[PDB]
C-alpha cells in the first residue's frame, strides 16, 4: 500500500500548510465581512485539523511514518506560503482559501484514486468524505464571491 | 366558521409556495452576504413550515380538509414562482423575501379579521403570532436593505 | 460534466419534494388505531426526506447545476403522482402508500448510485448510498408493521 | 366576579379532570396501552399546568381558589365512576375525549366572560388552554377513526 | 395487608397533595418566596410516591382508589378551607403534621409488607419514609426546632 | 398618548427607569431576606429588559423612533428616582418594587386599550403578555409582605 | 456464602439467555404494534444487560468466577431458546417476553431469599431492585395483552 | 477621581451610558451588515452590563455608594449621547462603538493605575480583565473598518 | 445476494461471540492498567453490539433470517471461547482482544468483497465503516502493547 | 436508636479521616499510573463526602449531634494518619486506599447490623448502599494490584 | 519562594478548618432562614475546597509538602473550633461565617503580599482571585445581617 | 527580544513548534500508558493552541504582525524538532513533553517580565495564566515519571 501511504502523508504535509494559511487569513483579515469570515476560518481550521489527524493516524495504522515536523510539512507540501499582509482585501483572502481548497479537493481525489487502485477502501472513504465537505465549502466561498463553484 | 377554514387553507397553499421561494433564494444566492443570508433562509423556512403545519392542523381540527398536493398549493396560492437564476443580486433576493413576507403579513391580517369576526379565537391567535414575527423580519430585512420597514 | 449524475440529483429534488408532500398528506389525513404513533413518525420521515432534498440540491449546485426550485418544476418532473387528501383511507393503506413511496425512492437512489458510480462522481455516489440505506431500513420496519417481509 | 367564578370553576373541573385521567392511566388494558398509558401522563401534566396558572390568576385577582377535595367534587360538573379494568382502550380514550370536550366548552365560557369584563389576561389563559385541548381532541378522535366534531 | 396500606397511601397522598397545594396558594408572610416554590417540590415528590404506590398495587392485582370521593373518604388527613390569614409558621407547622402522618403511614407500610414477605413494596415505603423524615428535619429546623421524629 | 407608537415609546422610557430602580434595590438592599431578594432583582431586571427591547423594536417595526438616551428616558418617564440609600428596609424595598410594577401594569393596560382601539393586535398582545407577568409578580411580592395583591 | 454466589451465577446465565430471546423478538417481530414494541425490546435488553453486569461483578467482588462463554450461558440457563420465526404474532411475542420476565422475577425472588438467609444484604438489594422493575414490566406487558398481571 | 472607589463609580456612570449608546446603535442600525452587527451589539451590551455590575458591587464591597439613578449616570459620565438617527452608515455606527470602547479602555487603564497605586489588587484585576476584552473588540471592529487597532 | 446474506449472518454469530469474549476480558482482568482497560472493554462491547444489530437488521432487511440463539452463535462462529481465568496477564488479555479484532477486520474485508461483487453497496458500506474503526483500535491496542499495528 | 446513632457518628469521624487520607494519596502520589489514580482519588473523595454528609444528616434527623470539629474526628476515628511521603510507590498508595476501604466496609457492615437490630430501616439502607459501592471499589483496586478482592 | 510556600501551607490548614466550621454551621443551623442558608453553606464549602486543592497543588508544584493530616490542619490553623450547638441563632451562625471569611481574606492578603515580594506571580494571582470572592461573600453576608461589609 | 510584542511573536513561533512536537508524541507513542497519554496529548495541544491564538491576537491588537508561516515558526522558535521515531519509550516521550513545557514556562516568565517592565498588564496576565497551567502540567508529568516537579 506504498502509494496509499505516500498520498496520506502528502495530505498530512498539505493539510498542515493549509492550516497555517487559514490561520494567517484569520489573523490578517481586514475589511467589511471580517466579523463573519474571521471566525469562519476557525471552523475551517478545525475541520482541516480533523482531516489531518485522521489521515495521519490512518497512515500510522497502515504501518507508515507520518511527517511530524514543520520542516517535513513545508518541504513536502505543494502549497506555498507568503508573509502575512493586512492589505490583502476580503475578496482576495476568500479567493486564496478557495485556491487552497481547490488544491485539497484535487489532492483528495488523488488519494481517492490511488487508494481505490490499491484496494484500500478504508482510506478511500476518508478521502471521499473530506472531498465532499471541501467541495461544498468551495461552492459557498465562490457564492459569497458572486461566482459559480467551477469545480 | 367557513371563512376561517378558507383563510387557513389559503395560508397552507401560500406558505407552501413561500417555502419553495425561500428554498430557491437559499440555493441560487450569490454575492457578498451569502454566508449570513444563506443560513438565514433556513431559519425563515423552518418558521414558515411551523406556521404551515399549525394552520393546517387547526383547519383539520375545525373539520376542514387541508390542501395537501403540490397542484393544490400552486393553484390556490396567490404567490407566483419563477425559475431560479444565479444572477439575481443579493439585494434583489432579499427584496423578494420582503415582498413574500409582506404578502404573508397581509394574509395573516385577513386571517385575524376573519377568525375574529367568526369568534374563532384560537385561529385568531395563530395568525397574530405569525404576523408578529413576520413583521419583525420585515423590519430586519428592510434595515439590511438600508430602508425603513414601511409596513 | 457528470451529465447524468446531475440529472439524477435533480430528479431526486423533484421526487423528494413530491414525496414530502405525500408524507405530509398522510400525516394530516391519518385516522385509525396507530395514529398516535404513525402521525409523528411521518414528521421524522419528512425531516429525513427534507435532509436528502437539501443535500442533493446543494450537491447539484456544487457541481454547476441548477436545481428545480418551483412547485411546477417539482410536479412536472417527479414520477410520483398525488391524489386529494382522504380521511377514509385506513392506517394500513396509509402505511402501504408510504412503503410504495419509499420503494420508489430506494429505486431512484439506486439509479443515482449506479449513475454516479459510472461517471466517477464518488461524493454523489455516497450521498445516494446513505439515503438508500436508510430508506430500505424504513421499508423493513413499515412492512413489519404491516405483517410483511421487506420484499426489497 | 364572573371571571373569578369561571377561574374557580376550572380549578374544580381541572382537579377532577386530573383524577379521571389518572384513573384512565391506571386501569387501562388492551392493545395500545404502551402508547396511551404514558400519554395520560402528558395530559395530566398539561392539566395540572392550567390548574395552577388559573388558580394563581384567581389569587392575583383577589379571589380564594377551591383548595380541598370536597370543593373540587361538589363544584365540578365532571362525574367520576369507580375504576374498572373491563373498559376497552377505545372507551377509555372516548372518556378522555368527553372530558376534553367539557374543558374546551368551559374554557370558551371563560374566554367569553373575561372578554366581556375586559380581563384580557384571564382571556388569554383560557384561549391558550382551549387551543391545546382542541388539538388533543382532534388527535384522540383520529385514533378513534373519527373527525374531531368540535 | 400490603395492598390495603398501598391504597391507604394513595388516598392520603392525594389529600396531602391538595393540602400542600393549599399552602402553596394561600401562603403570605416573610419566607413566601422560598416556601411557595418549595411546596411545588414537595407536591412533585408526593405525586411520585402516589403513582409509584398505586402502580405497585395494580401490579399486585389490586384496584387503586381513583376518584376524589374515594381519596377523601379513605384518607385519614383532614382538609379545611383555604385561609390567607394563616401565618407562614402555621403553614409550615401544618406541612410537618402532614409529613409526620405520612412517615408513620410509610412505617406501617414497611412493617406490613415486611411481615408479608413483599420486599419490593417494603422498599418503596422505606425510600419514601427516608425522604419525608429528612424533610421533617429541615422544616423543623426552619421552625427553630429539633426533628422530634 | 394618542396612539400605539406613543405608548410603546412611553414604555421604553418607563422600563429604562424601572430597570435603574430595580438595580438600585439590588445594590443597596440590606436586611433579612437579602440572599433571596438580591438575585430576584436580577430576574426582574432581565424580564424588564425583555419588555424594553420587544416594545422598542415593535415601535421601530411600526416606523417610529424609540427614545435612546438617558435624558430622554429620564424626562419622558413618569417614574421618579431617588438617591441610593442603604438604610431602606427590605420590606420598604419590596414595597417600592410593587409601586413600580403597579405603575407598569397600568401603563400596559393603557397600551392594551390604545392598541385594541387602533386594531394593532401584535402590539396589543405584547402589552397583554407583559401585564400578565407583572401582575403575577405583584401577587408574590405582596404575599411576601403579608398583603393581598390589591390590583 | 456459596448459595448467593450460585444464584448470582445462575442469573448471569439466565440474563444472557434472556437478552438473546429479547433480541430475537426485536428482530423477528411482525404485525401491528411493531413500531412501539421493536424499540421497547431495546429498553428491556439494556435493562437486562445492566442486571447481568451488576450481578456478574457482585459475584467477582465476592470471590467468584462468573460464567463468561456462550456455552456456559446456554447450558446453565433454565430458559430455552428456539429458532427465530417471523410468523409469530405480536401477542405471542409479548407473551413470550412475559414468560421470560416471570422466570426472571422468580429467579430474583430466589436470589433475594438465598442472599437474605446468608446475610449478604448487598446481593439482596441487587435482586430486590431488579425484581421490582421486572414485575412493573409484567403488569404493563399484561395490560397491553388485555390481562391482569397475575403475579 | 483620585481613588479606586471614585474610578469604580466613574465606571458605573460611563458603563451605564455606554450601554445606552450601544442600544441606540442596535435599534437605529441600517445598511449591509445589519444582520451581523445588530445582534453583535447585544453581546457588547451584555459584556458592558457584566462590567457595570461587578464594578458597582466591588464599590459596595469597599464601602462606597454606587451611582444608581439615570441622573447620576448622565451627569457623571464623560460620554455624550445624541438623538437616535436611522441614516447613519454602518461604518459610522462601528466608528462610534470604537470611540466608546477607546474611552472605556482608557478609563480602565486609569482604574488599573489608581488601584495598583492603592494596593487594591482585587479592583486592579477587574479593570485589567475588562480592558483586555475591550481592546480585543477594538481590534476586531477596526479590522471590519479595514484599519489597524491603533490603541 | 446469497453471499452478502451469508457473510452478514456469519458476522452476527462472530460479533455475538466477540462480545462474550470482551465481556470475559472486562470481568477477569487483573494487573496494572485495569482501571483503564476494564471500562475500555465496555466501549468496545458497545461498538461490537452496534455492528451486531446493524448487520443483523441489514440481513433482515435483505430478506434473511439472522442467527438469534446462543447455540446458533456458538456453532456458527469461527471464534473460540475458553473458561474465564483471573491469572491471564493484562498483556495477554489485550493480545487476545487484538486477535479477536484481527479476525473481525478480516471477516469485514470478506464482507466488503462479497457485497462489492454482488453490487450490495449498502452492506458494502456497513462492512467498510466497521473495518475502519476496528483497524484503528488494533493500532491503539498494539501501540499499548509496544508494537506496530501489523495489519 | 442509641447505637444506630453511635455508629452513624463513628462513620462521620471515620469518613472525615478517610477523606483526609485520600487527599494525601491524591497529593503525594508519584509513579506510573499517576494520571489515572490522581483524579480517581477525587471521585473516591466526592463519594466519601456524600456518605459523610448523608450519615451526619441522618444522625441529626434522629435527634443526634454529629461530631463537627477535627478534634472530634481525630479522637473518634479508628483510622490512623501519617505524614505525607512522596517516596511511597503507586502500588503502596493504592494498597493504603484498599485498607481504608476494607475498614469502611467493615464499619458499614457494623452500621447495617446495628440498625437492623433496632429496626431503623432508613439508616439500614444507607449503610447497605455505601457498603455495596466500597466493596466494588475494593474489587477494582485489588484487580489493578493483580489481586483477588479478598473481602 | 520560602514565604510563598509557607503561606500556601497555612491556607491548606486554615481552609481545612474553615470547611469543618462551615459544615458545622450547615448541620447545626436552626431558625428562620435555614432553607436558604443551609444549602448556601454547601456552595461556600465547595468554593473553600477549591481553594484548598489549588493552593495545596501550587505548593506541591513549587516543591513543597502540604499538610495532609487532621493533626497538621488543626495544629497549624489559626482558626478555633467549638462543639456543635443547635441553640446558636441563625444570625450568630452567619456572624461566625463572616469572621472566618474575614480571617481568610486577611490570610489571602498576606499570601498576596508575600508572593508579590517573592516574585511568585502565579501564587499571587491565586490569592487575589480567592480574596475577591471571599470579600464579595462578606458584603453579601453583612447585607443579610443589616450591616456594611466593613472590610 | 526586547518588548512585549517581540516576546508575543516568539511565543507564536515556539507554541507552533511545541504543537508540532506534541502531535509527534501523540502519533509515535508506543508502550504501556499509550491509552492514557495519547489522548492527553490532544488536551495539551488544544491548550497550547489556545495560547498561540490569544498571544497572536494580542500582538495583532498591539499593532504587530504575527509570524504566520511554517518557515517563520521553525526559524524563529528555539525548540528543535527531530524525525518521528516509534522506538522512543513512553517515559522518554513524557520527558520530552516536560522539556518542552519547561521551555514554555521559561518563555512565559520572560513574557511576564518584559510586559511588566513596559506596564502592559493585559499581556502580562496572558503570560501569567499560561505559565500557571504549564507549571501544573509539569508537576503532573513529573509525578507520572516518579519525580518532583523541579521547576
Ligand atoms: Ca451576481
Ligand atoms: Ca403475521
Ligand atoms: Ca509488548
Ligand atoms: Ca518513587
Ligand atoms: Ca433557636
Ligand atoms: Cl460551476
Ligand atoms: Cl450581489
Ligand atoms: Cl369535524
Ligand atoms: Cl400480529
Ligand atoms: Cl499484568
Ligand atoms: Cu490523534
Ligand atoms: Cu403536523
Ligand atoms: Cu441548504
Ligand atoms: Cu403554583
Ligand atoms: Cu403512572
Ligand atoms: Cu434588540
Ligand atoms: Cu462491567
Ligand atoms: Cu448584581
Ligand atoms: Cu435493533
Ligand atoms: Cu448537608
Ligand atoms: Cu487535587
Ligand atoms: Cu483567533
The bound ligand whose nearest atom lies closest to the alpha carbon of B86 is 1
d(CA B8, CA B54): 9
Please name the residues in contact with I52: beta carbons below 8 A apart, sequence gap of 6 or more: I11, I12, I15, I16, I19
d(CA L40, CA L28): 14
| K137 and H CB contact within 8 Å | no
Nearest to G97 by CA among G26, G8, G12: G26
Q: Chains that contact D by 3+ CB pairs under 8 Å?
A: B, C, E, F, G
What distance in Å separates residue H84's CA from the closest CA in chain B? 14
What distance in Å separates residue H148's CA from the closest CA in chain F? 30
Cα end-to-end distance, chain G, whole Å: 29
Please judge whether A40 and B38 are an interchain contact, meaning their C-beta atoms are less than 8 angstroms apart: no
Neighbour-count burial of A6, counting CB atoms closer than 10 A to its CB (0-12 exposed, 13-18 middle, 19+ buried)? middle
Neighbour-count burial of J43, counting CB atoms closer than 10 A to its CB (0-12 exposed, 13-18 middle, 19+ buried)? exposed
Q: Chains that contact E by 3+ CB pairs under 8 Å?
A: D, F, G, J, K
Please judge whether I149 and A122 are an interchain contact, meaning their C-beta atoms are less than 8 angstroms apart: no
Q: Are E149 and J62 in contact (CB under 8 A)?
A: yes
Q: Are A133 and A47 in contact (CB under 8 A)?
A: yes
d(CA A105, CA A149): 12
What distance in Å separates residue K90's CA from the closest CA in chain E? 9
| J71 and K CB contact within 8 Å | yes
Please judge whether G32 and C145 are an interchain contact, meaning their C-beta atoms are less than 8 angstroms apart: yes
Backbone φ/ψ region at I134: left (φ over 0), alpha (ψ -120 to 50), beta: alpha
Greatest Cα pair distance in chain J: 48
Nearest to E37 by CA among F144, D67, D47, F51: F144
Nearest to G34 by CA among G75, G86, G74: G86
The bound ligand whose nearest atom lies closest to the alpha carbon of J88 is 4
Please judge whether C35 and D146 are an interchain contact, meaning their C-beta atoms are less than 8 angstroms apart: no
d(CA J149, CA L125): 50
- Please check whether the domain covering C1-152 is classified as CATH 3.40.50.300: no
Please judge whether J60 and E149 are an interchain contact, meaning their C-beta atoms are less than 8 angstroms apart: no
Classified by CATH at the fold level, domain K1-151 comes out as: Ferritin (1.20.1260)
All cell numbers assigned to L20: 508540532
Please judge whether E35 and K35 are an interchain contact, meaning their C-beta atoms are less than 8 angstroms apart: yes
Q: Are G20 and G97 in contact (CB under 8 A)?
A: no
Q: Are D21 and D51 in contact (CB under 8 A)?
A: no
| Closest residue in F to K139 (Cα–Cα) | F30
Please judge whether C36 and D146 are an interchain contact, meaning their C-beta atoms are less than 8 angstroms apart: no
Q: Which CATH superfamily is domain D1-150 in?
A: Ferritin, core subunit, four-helix bundle (1.20.1260.10)
Residues of B in contact with C83 (CB under 8 A): 69
Nearest to G150 by CA among D88, E53, E59, E118: E59
All cell numbers assigned to D123: 382571556
d(CA L127, CA K117): 19
Please judge whether H143 and A36 are an interchain contact, meaning their C-beta atoms are less than 8 angstroms apart: no
What distance in Å separates residue I25's CA from the closest CA in chain G? 9
CA of K49 to the centre of ligand 21 (A): 10
Nearest to J73 by CA among L92, A45, E86, K21: K21
The bound ligand whose nearest atom lies closest to the alpha carbon of C149 is 2
Residues of C in contact with A131 (CB under 8 A): 122-123
Rg (CA), chain F: 16
**Planar angle of CA I38, I39, I42, nearest 5 degrees:** 105
d(CA K104, CA K117): 20
What distance in Å separates residue C120's CA from the closest CA in chain B? 25
Rounded to 10 deg, the angle between the L121-144 and K121-144 helix axes is: 110
Question: Is the Cα dihedral E113, E114, E116, E121 positive or negative?
Answer: positive
3-state SS, residue J10: helix
Distances in Å between the alpha carbon of I31 and those of C32, I90, J22, J34, K126? 61, 6, 22, 15, 39
Distances in Å between the alpha carbon of G145 and those of D36, G97, G138? 14, 12, 10
| Closest residue in F to B137 (Cα–Cα) | F61
What distance in Å separates residue B41's CA from the closest CA in chain A? 14
Q: How many CA atoms lie within 13 A of E97 on its CB side?
A: 14
Please judge whether C33 and D145 are an interchain contact, meaning their C-beta atoms are less than 8 angstroms apart: yes
CA of F55 to the centre of ligand 16 (A): 9
Residues of J in contact with L144 (CB under 8 A): 31-35
Q: Are F31 and F146 in contact (CB under 8 A)?
A: no
d(CA I128, CA A129): 13
What distance in Å separates residue H58's CA from the closest CA in chain A? 33
Q: Chains that contact J by 3+ CB pairs under 8 Å?
A: E, G, I, K, L
All cell numbers assigned to E21: 397545594
Q: How many CA atoms lie within 13 A of K68 on its CB side?
A: 23
Q: Are C2 and C63 in contact (CB under 8 A)?
A: yes
Sorted by where each begins, the domain ranges of chain C are 1-152
CA of I142 to the centre of ligand 3 (A): 8
| C82 and B CB contact within 8 Å | yes
Taking the CB of residue E47, how many other CB atoms lie within 10 A of it? 18
d(CA F135, CA E9): 38
3-state SS, residue L21: helix
d(CA C123, CA A139): 14
Cα end-to-end distance, chain F, whole Å: 23
F57 is in an annotated binding site: yes
- Which technique was used to obtain these atomic coordinates? X-ray
CA of I124 to the centre of ligand 16 (A): 52
All cell numbers assigned to I52: 451486531
Q: Are H147 and H61 in contact (CB under 8 A)?
A: no
Residues of B in contact with C25 (CB under 8 A): 68-69
Q: Looking at the partner chain, which of B57, B61, B125 has a beta carbon nearest the beta carbon of D150? A: B61
Instruction: Indicate the DSSP class of residue K89.
Output: -
d(CA H35, CA H37): 6
CA of J145 to the centre of ligand 10 (A): 9
Residues of B in contact with C19 (CB under 8 A): none
Q: Looking at the partner chain, which of K33, K37, K143 has a beta carbon nearest the beta carbon of F30? A: K143
d(CA F127, CA F15): 13
Q: At which residue does the C-alpha cell 439500614 appear?
A: J124
D52 is in an annotated binding site: yes
Distances in Å between the alpha carbon of E18 and those of A151, D60, D70, J103? 70, 20, 10, 47
Phi, psi (deg, nearest 5) at residue L66: -70, 145
Chains J and I touch, using 3 or more CB pairs below 8 Å: yes
| E54 and D CB contact within 8 Å | yes
Nearest to K8 by CA among K79, K112, K111: K111
Q: Are J60 and K34 in contact (CB under 8 A)?
A: no
Nearest to J53 by CA among K31, K11, K46, E123: K46
Rounded to 10 deg, the angle between the J90-117 and J34-61 helix axes is: 20
Chains J and L touch, using 3 or more CB pairs below 8 Å: yes
Q: Looking at the partner chain, which of I57, I63, I121 has a beta carbon nearest the beta carbon of C152? A: I63
d(CA L58, CA L72): 18
Residues of K in contact with L129 (CB under 8 A): 125
d(CA H144, CA I8): 57
Residues of L in contact with I89 (CB under 8 A): none
d(CA E54, CA E52): 6
d(CA H62, CA F36): 22
D22 is in an annotated binding site: no
Q: At which residue does the C-alpha cell 481552609 appear?
A: K15
How far, in whole angstroms, is CA B90 from its chain's centroid?
19
| I60 and C CB contact within 8 Å | yes
Phi, psi (deg, nearest 5) at residue F97: -65, -45
All cell numbers assigned to G151: 403475579
The bound ligand whose nearest atom lies closest to the alpha carbon of E64 is 15
What distance in Å separates residue K78's CA from the closest CA in chain F? 29
| F96 and H CB contact within 8 Å | no
Q: How many CA atoms lie within 13 A of J92 on its CB side?
A: 9
| G40 and D CB contact within 8 Å | yes
Which residue pairs, CB below 8 angstroms and at least 24 apart, start in F77-80?
F77/F13, F77/F14, F77/F16, F77/F17, F78/F10, F78/F14, F78/F103, F79/F14, F79/F17, F79/F18, F79/F21, F79/F103
Q: Are C46 and C23 in contact (CB under 8 A)?
A: yes
d(CA K101, CA K141): 10
Q: What dotted CATH number matches E1-149?
A: 1.20.1260.10
How far, in whole angstroms, is CA K140 from its chain's centroid?
16
Nearest to C11 by CA among C72, C62, C59, C56: C56
What distance in Å separates residue H26's CA from the closest CA in chain F? 10
Nearest to H51 by CA among H11, H80, H98: H11
All cell numbers assigned to D129: 388552554
Residues of E in contact with F40 (CB under 8 A): 33
By the CB criterion, residues less than 5 angstroms from ion ligand 7 are B 31, 89-90
Q: Looking at the partner chain, which of H68, H81, H86 has a beta carbon nearest the beta carbon of F84? A: H68
Q: Are J131 and J108 in contact (CB under 8 A)?
A: yes
Please name the residues in contact with D99: beta carbons below 8 A apart, sequence gap of 6 or more: D17, D20, D21, D78
Rounded to 10 deg, the angle between the B34-61 and H34-61 helix axes is: 90
| B42 and H CB contact within 8 Å | no
Q: Are A90 and A119 in contact (CB under 8 A)?
A: no
Q: Are F4 and F123 in contact (CB under 8 A)?
A: yes
All cell numbers assigned to C86: 382522504
Amino acid at each position: 500500500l506504498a502509494d496509499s501511504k505516500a498520498v496520506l502523508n502528502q495530505a498530512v504535509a498539505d493539510l498542515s500548510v493549509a492550516h497555517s494559511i487559514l490561520h494567517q487569513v484569520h489573523w490578517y483579515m481586514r475589511g467589511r465581512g471580517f466579523m463573519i469570515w474571521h471566525p469562519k476560518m476557525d471552523e475551517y481550521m478545525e475541520e482541516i485539523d480533523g482531516y489531518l489527524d485522521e489521515m495521519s493516524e490512518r497512515l500510522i495504522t497502515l504501518g507508515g511514518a507520518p511527517f511530524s515536523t514543520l520542516k517535513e510539512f513545508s518541504e513536502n507540501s505543494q502549497l506555498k506560503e507568503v508573509l502575512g499582509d493586512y492589505n490583502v482585501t476580503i475578496e482576495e483572502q476568500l479567493a486564496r482559501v478557495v485556491e487552497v481548497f481547490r488544491y485539497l479537493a484535487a489532492l483528495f481525489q488523488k488519494g481517492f484514486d490511488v487508494s481505490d487502485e490499491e484496494g484500500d477502501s478504508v482510506t478511500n472513504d476518508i478521502f471521499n468524505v473530506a472531498k465532499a465537505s471541501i467541495e461544498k465549502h468551495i461552492w459557498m466561498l465562490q457564492a459569497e464571491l458572486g461566482q459559480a463553484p467551477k469545480l
